[PDB]
Design a protein around this nucleic acid. Sequence first.
RNA 1: UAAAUCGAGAG
Lengths: 98, 64, 131, 171, 446, 69, 115, 58, 304
Amino acid sequence: EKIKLLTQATSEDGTSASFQIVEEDHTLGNALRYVIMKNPDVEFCGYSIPHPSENLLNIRIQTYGETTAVDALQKGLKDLMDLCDVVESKFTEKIKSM
Amino acid sequence: VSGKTLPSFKPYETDAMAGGYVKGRFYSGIKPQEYYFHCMAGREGLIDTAVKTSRSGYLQRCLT
Amino acid sequence: NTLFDDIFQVSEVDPGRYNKVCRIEAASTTQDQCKLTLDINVELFPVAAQDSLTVTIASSLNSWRPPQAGDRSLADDYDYVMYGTAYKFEEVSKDLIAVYYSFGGLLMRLEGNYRNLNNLKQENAYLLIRR
Amino acid sequence: STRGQYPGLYLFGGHSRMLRPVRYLPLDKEDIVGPFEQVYMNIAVTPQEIQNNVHTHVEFTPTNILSILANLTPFSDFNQSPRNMYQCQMGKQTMGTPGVALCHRSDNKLYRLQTGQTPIVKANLYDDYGMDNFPNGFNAVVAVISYTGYDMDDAMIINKSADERGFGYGT
Amino acid sequence: VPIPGVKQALEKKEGLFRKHMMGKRVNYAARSVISPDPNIETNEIGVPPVFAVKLTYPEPVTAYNIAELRQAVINGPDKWPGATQIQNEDGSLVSLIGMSVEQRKALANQLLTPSSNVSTHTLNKKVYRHIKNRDVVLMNRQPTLHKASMMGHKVRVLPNEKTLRLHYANTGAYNADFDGDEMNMHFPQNENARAEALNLANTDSQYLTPTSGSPVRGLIQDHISAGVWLTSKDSFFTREQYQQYIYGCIRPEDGHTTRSKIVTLPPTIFKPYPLWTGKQIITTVLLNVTPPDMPGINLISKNKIKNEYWGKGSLENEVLFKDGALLCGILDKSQYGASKYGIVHSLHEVYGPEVAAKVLSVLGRLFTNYITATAFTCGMDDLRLTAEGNKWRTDILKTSVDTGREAAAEVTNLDKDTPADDPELLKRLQEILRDNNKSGILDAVT
Amino acid sequence: MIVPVRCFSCGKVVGDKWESYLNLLQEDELDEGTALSRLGLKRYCCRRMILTHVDLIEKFLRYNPLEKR
Amino acid sequence: SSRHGQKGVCSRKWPTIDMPFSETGIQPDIIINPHAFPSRMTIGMFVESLAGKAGALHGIAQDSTPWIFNEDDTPADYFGEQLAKAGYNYHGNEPMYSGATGEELRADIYVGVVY
Amino acid sequence: NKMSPYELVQHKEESDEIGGYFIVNGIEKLIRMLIVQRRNHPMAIIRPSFANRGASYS
Amino acid sequence: EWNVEKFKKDFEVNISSLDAREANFDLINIDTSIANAFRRIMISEVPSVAAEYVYFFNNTSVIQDEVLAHRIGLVPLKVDPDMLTWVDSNLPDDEKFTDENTIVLSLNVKCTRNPDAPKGSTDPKELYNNAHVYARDLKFEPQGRQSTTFADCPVVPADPDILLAKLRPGQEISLKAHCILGIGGDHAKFSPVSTASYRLLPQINILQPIKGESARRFQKCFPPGVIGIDEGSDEAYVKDARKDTVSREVLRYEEFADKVKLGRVRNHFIFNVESAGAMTPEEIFFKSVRILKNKAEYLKNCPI
RNA sequence: UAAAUCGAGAG
Ligand SMILES: [Zn+2]
């Protein structure tokens, strides 16, 4: 129950969906939103905090077809991981020099 | 009674500032006489604010 | 398909307390009756006084979606493309029609002879600027 | 005077009179004046505003017309007068330092600020009354910004981390 | 001074008619200092956990109810949502306070047990459940000068602090600031008073005051300047910014939108790169909140900022909604806010009150999220004048060195140019001062 | 009362720089700004931590119930 | 409250990562809306913020007894020159970044030190 | 009365303790200064209530 | 078509300095979303160690127990956070703390008057013994196997001169502090970074040549190592834009009001990380990027 | 468990 699909927003086709994540803020949400907005198949992506006092985050993902919103979320998570990995590799390489 | 608006103004002085005309602004501050006059105005405003609330409840009570 | 074509000489550019947009007054070089005022963001398409602009109003470019590789449009032949709605028509006098377009809040007033502007309707339209 | 106050010379030396120090311009000395004595002579509020043959006194400083609380508000001549009155009202209601002998008191109720600070901006009279012995508030980095949305009418936002570091803690 | 009699116990205020019959003290009511809260639906009240634990409602147990009431009984009196008491058919009031979880499960499993007594066979038990998110509450702030100062709000319970959190739009009717102001929440204990607060005292029904028909609800201070900046001509937003601004306020899982899918608009500028506009943000907000199978709004109105404040040839003073799309003008206090014939007033008149309330909430969230990314500030630079402005001010104020003397000369009937120390002028000024009527015209002419 | 352990605004530890600040002001005839700079307090959020401390605890300490006077 | 009658209750203890942060790395411990000054006219609070930042930067204390300044030597000029001699800008504004989005704000933010 | 601040601290009072207040039942009280008419000065008064002191009263 | 390969080709790190308490480096061609995520994770999410619980046995001093416990919680401990695990809140207070997740500190200081004090002395060091209580007085008591794994690096406050309390004869403080693993988003005492923040690279665009004496005035409006007069011809150029704050003092003069523009390189961040002492800033940034990667991985591996 | 009166405050 870390991340949940909101059935009041998901479509029977599967292209449009809303995900609610517990214990998140504008830290994972902003990065994930940008990284998945890099996806050419994604039409609409956004993140919203219902209330600041609750550790709940929402991501809305709607595609152009040919790809579900869950697949878009997976691609965004993998791309964010790879982005962090390359910044880690660059930092480690630069530490050795100076 | 002497005709002075303030100790620092000569009796019956024909000046706008003597009568309470503040040429200063809150950006550059106001002179002590202007400060005193503005304090008079603010105190009168607070007195009116206090006395206005007490002066209206009975009308609404009687009407209601 | 195209609904209006012309070339305009820009007379003045007044910033008007805006850091990105400007209001452009331009007079057509072919017909003396055709004048145009137009709000354009000069951060992207900068203009200056005494500048010749090729202006084209079209009905389409042949929902929206960001372009992919190998996308064919009428926008390729022009530099600055806006999309807007016509909301007002008026008659300056006999044989004079002024049409008002709103591109997301940026106003354009186009005044010209009713026979030159007869192709303009009260509909969505693309405004394309070149040079 | 024509239908004014009853004329005459009166001398008072009794108890309970209200007296304030003005500066007698001849001899450049200190004089003591009272309310009855004051309404007929002219005291210049500052030596730069003295006029010939019409002023006989000046005030040592125009800040001695104010009380302690009215003198302790910074840049008082720039605020609106109701705000100065409100500050004088709310300077007596802070959770500051009542005293240092609290171990031997037995008061019914007491509020104490754990860590007070001296102001960076303060009047010269602040040190004359030893207000440093009784701190009242804290110096705070204050951003005048419309950013949060939770402070519009009169509310304010406090940093959560600053709060957890003792900013404003009390007993 | 003497002992009051029977008459003295009834006659005046603090008697028995005005103090214990027309005005009484009530149960199931809390009082607290309010704090502001966006992210509240402008018809809701944010209640503290303490109030959510103390305040309760008697829900009779039924066949459709045992799913929630059993869990409420299990949760106990100190875990919201929970139950604090059980009323059997005979009237027994079994308290859940001093009981363990196992006893609570035993009691919960015996909620919908049919009665063994014929005298109460028509009755069912009641669970005094905690206040929930589907309950209504009567909010009132003294003095209650007009009826809009006592409304009905849908309860949302918050997890953190002991204040009643209230939306900014409600401050217009309550005349409430957040300067330590306090107010009272009342919990109706039957369905008859529930329906009244949800339909008659409902805060959605209170958009227009009955005094003159003017509205008394709308965004107040930060949102107005936020919308002045956002609906300007300089407001261009990339696709990511546009879509994030739209989803930040029209979340299609809380019922904020109608079409189950956030529909967007083609960008204003196609080349060189796609840019939207703030007026387009307003347009798509309206398009998402406005119900389908219905045309868009058509309004020609004005705002508070003259066209001269936007440069030459600007027409941003005239607001123009056409077919539900903002095409001109700035959204202002006169558009959203307690003001007549604005966009919100028109939406209320055309689409109903619930749509207008939803639009108020959406606009509040939108401007809150725009201000948190594009901040607004005031400083000492805003208060200054140029060198020429100060020169103009000094030159004009120097001409006032003779105003008082000229006014006095006019009142004293001296001709003009008379020196301030003219003995006749001084004599007549002294005469004027001694009179309350002549000095009343001297202080009016000057 | 006593010097705070950390600066409120940022969290930099400044509780180890109060006796040092007093000694810098006392022995070396320094102004407050230079003494604060030498202690490593750059941002004014940290500077007003030690610049404006009153150190009231000393006045508290003279009232000692546990020792005769 | 401040020493200029700007009373108000705390609304939310904003987590420090969500607060705006300046080019120097600091974040304010108090946020007061700019919409409280125009109707109250507490310019003394503005000039006290200016003087407080200047004094904290220079490690000095500025006296604020009324009527020490004139219409010629405005306190804004005095404290602005003090701020400029230390690097910060004349008007007391600072470039800040939103702690949520991470982008720089539209204009410089007025921030100082007040009691 | 004439105790130095050091002696005041030694007797648990305060560094700069000021008087002007009595202690009654452990509660500190003071007697507020009042404003009253100035002494030994006959001031002319035009007061309507004098007419209410009876008939033929100015 | 954005791709991780393109970002890997365009991303570059430019370290300007590196210390044991502060790292000032640069991140180029990265979106402010990722940079702000790194900043927030550094401030709020990378774990550290601080005294969470305090058990008091005697506090006869002039400081109340809650304030003293708060201060003891606010002193940074120089213990590498990797050496201990996380406690369980759902565990009972008996067995919640083990030798693998909690570090025990003890403070037992009793003040007493020094009889050999010099005559006519006012210094509280010559007068009293143990008058001042410092963080270095927090003795570390290794319990269990931590007596061996902490033998190479014993627990000691990062700043030992922190003044915890002041005492007078007869007054004493005896207490224990249990220090556990925690993050800065729970309480500000667990944040390992004294301050983490980036700033956009200032960009000074000279629109028109400022040749001549005015250049000296133009050079005067910036910090010294920013605007330089060209050696060949009297003319200004941007020597180094990292050394100026955005003060816009040049904007206050009508002479240069129309001859310069100030902007930012809005993908070029200068990160200045100042640590508290328990970790080096390079390891703090490494842990931040690792935390973001692990957060994304955990979100990816959870069933929907 | 109560009631007045006085005093101090908040909106
Ligand atoms: Zn700091």
